[PDB]
Amino acid sequence: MTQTPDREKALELAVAQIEKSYGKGSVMRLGDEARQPISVIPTGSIALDVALGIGGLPRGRVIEIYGPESSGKTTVALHAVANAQAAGGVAAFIDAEHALDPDYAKKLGVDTDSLLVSQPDTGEQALEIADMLIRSGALDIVVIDSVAALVPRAELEGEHVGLQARLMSQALRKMTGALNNSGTTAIFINQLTGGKALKFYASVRMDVRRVETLKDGTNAVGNRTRVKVVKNKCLAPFKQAEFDILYGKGISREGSLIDMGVDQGLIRKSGAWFTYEGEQLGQGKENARNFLVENADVADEIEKKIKEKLG
């Protein structure tokens, strides 16, 4: 075929036809900039917010955060809970592992007092409680802790396998419509279990892993986490982000502005020195981090400028 411009026109229509019938993110190009809603729940680190593309987590979708035991996951999730909360929204936490540290959560900014928490007897139950809690159109973010811990009635009774992968499927189908119709975003912490089902219904899927144990000079102030969004029907996939999660403090927002500040020219590193638009922030990443945290006025100035240079 001798073609050239007529090809790009047939392809444009093609994609058009696919998008129409299977949805917006049905086909995309890794270089696309497209889409940007009015609704998004910040993750807590600008780094990850841009990797997600839409500036945070998509509302009305089912998100899946998975990873090894002790990388971030819950932290990242608790953050998405604190931010949904900071906009006067209400959060729920269906708990099946019995491992939540309210003190840590309150430190991340979770209004633990108004945190609807429930600890189900079986897995099916856990989904239903989250299902009707979802349908009241009152909840903004609902997090289900551990898909692996959602044991089914049968197994919990004695009465073989193929339980979870069924229990989840039946749920996700039904729960997917309710979600897309309520503007609520559900986060599933997973082990990397419920497998397939969640892997496909989910609009976003994040692989969180602990890169390095942040050397504080002394012992360790935090950990350098790395998320890799393997699935994103909201924007070009396969993007990644690294951020610090300080022991007891959570994700360093300030540490993200610096990292993103330099990689965008907004902050200049003149050899051990960090400078921003004339004046020096400090000597060392942690110094500047501490500078930015004590001086919020300038901290969100950087966040602002970088959000203007992207979105």
Swiss-Prot record:
Subcellular location: Cytoplasm
Record NCBIfam families: intein_Cterm, intein_Nterm, PRK09519.1, tigrfam_recA
Residues bound to ATP: 67-74
InterPro entries recorded: AAA+_ATPase, DNA_recomb/repair_RecA, DNA_recomb/repair_RecA_CS, Hint_dom_C, Hint_dom_N, Hint_dom_sf, Homing_endonucl, INTEIN
Protein name: Protein RecA
Protein family per UniProt: Belongs to the RecA family.
Transmembrane parts of this sequence: none
PTM notes: This protein undergoes a protein self splicing that involves a post-translational excision of the intervening region (intein) followed by peptide ligation.
Stored SMART domains: AAA, HintC, HintN
Function as written in the Swiss-Prot or TrEMBL entry: Can catalyze the hydrolysis of ATP in the presence of single-stranded DNA, the ATP-dependent uptake of single-stranded DNA by duplex DNA, and the ATP-dependent hybridization of homologous single-stranded DNAs. It interacts with LexA causing its activation and leading to its autocatalytic cleavage. PI-MtuI is an endonuclease.
Gene3D superfamilies: Hedgehog/Intein (Hint) domain (2.170.16.10), Homing endonucleases (3.10.28.10), P-loop containing nucleotide triphosphate hydrolases (3.40.50.300), RecA protein, C-terminal domain (3.30.250.10)
